[PDB]
Amino acid sequence: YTTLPSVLLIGPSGAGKTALLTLFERGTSYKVDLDAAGATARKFLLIDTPGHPKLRGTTLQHLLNPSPSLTIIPTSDPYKSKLKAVIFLLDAAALADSDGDYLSQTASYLYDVLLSLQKRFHSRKNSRAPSSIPVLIAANKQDLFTAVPASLVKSRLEHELGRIRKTRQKGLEGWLGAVGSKEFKFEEMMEFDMEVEVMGGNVIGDGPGAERWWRWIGERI
Numbered sequence: 001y002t003t004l005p006s007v008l009l010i011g012p013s014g015a016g017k018t019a020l021l022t023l024f025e026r027g028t029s030y031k032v033d034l035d036a037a038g039a040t041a042r043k044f045l046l047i048d049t050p051g052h053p054k055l056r057g058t059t060l061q062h063l064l065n066p067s068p069s070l071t072i073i074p075t076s077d078p079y080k081s082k083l084k085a086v087i088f089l090l091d092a093a094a095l096a097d098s099d100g101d102y103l104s105q106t107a108s109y110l111y112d113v114l115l116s117l118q119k120r121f122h123s124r125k126n127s128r129a130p131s132s133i134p135v136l137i138a139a140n141k142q143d144l145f146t147a148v149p150a151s152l153v154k155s156r157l158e159h160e161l162g163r164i165r166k167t168r169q170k171g172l173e174g175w176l177g178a179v180g181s182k183e184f185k186f187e188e189m190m191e192f193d194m195e196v197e198v199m200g201g202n203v204i205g206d207g208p209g210a211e212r213w214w215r216w217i218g219e220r221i
């Protein structure tokens with residue numbers, strides 16, 4: 001038996017991953033309840049991950065795979081769920097700190113995500129191209145006055161991820177984005193049939209909300 005396609009919700013500790021699920025829901029294998037909001041209207045599953053670094057590997061593995069399917073346990077009888085998209089959630093308020101530490105740890109996680117998918121696109125011992133799996137970079141907590149707006153978030157990540165691929169090539173496959181690219185932009189990931197877009201929103205409090213996110217996603221699965 002099979003289930004609705006699922007969207008991998010990944011991001012660092014404290015982004016609001018666990019928070020967003022409940023909203024989604026309230027409207028290693030994975031143990032999701034196939035209930036109401038995803039079922040009744042959203043026709044896909046939102047799959048939560050752990051935030052800690054020690055645990056990122058399992059999340060990353062799914063991303064290497066040319067045709068990723070997730071094994072889910074509803075609330076015995078195991079299912080498979082076609083991985084069709086990814087939501088990269090981060091705390092946009094914590095990003096604002098002058099020290100620049102949040103951006104660094106966060107851009108590192110984000111790097112491996114896009115590069116994993118990048119390897120997955122190239123990797124073809126099966127001769128056909130692998131299916132497009134878009135990543136949505138969701139800048140959460142837009143209700144806080146101190147939260148960084150989505151357009152800055154977009155720009156800040158590119159500069160760090162570009163900084164990352166630069167510092168590593170100076171290690172004289174691990175190169176994110178195009179090989180001839182002079183400065184990094186998410187738009188150049190289109191060359192590997194992966195769509196990456198930064199979008200702001202919030203789960204609790206007063207602001208943009210989360211439906212724009214889901215609308216992006218549902219428009220893409």
Ligand SMILES: Nc1nc2c(ncn2[C@@H]2O[C@H](COP(=O)(O)OP(=O)(O)O)[C@@H](O)[C@H]2O)c(=O)[nH]1
Nearest residue numbers: 012013014015016017018019051141202203204
């Ligand atoms: N201000 C604000 N706080 C949020 C929002 N979403 C989540 N949080 C809080 O930020 C923290 C993030 O925690 P959590 O959901 O456990 O994130 P996780 O570590 O990634 O699983 C929690 O205390 C949430 O209550 C939001 O939209 N706005």
Ligand SMILES: [Mg+2]
Nearest residue numbers: 017018049051
């Ligand atoms: Mg959590």
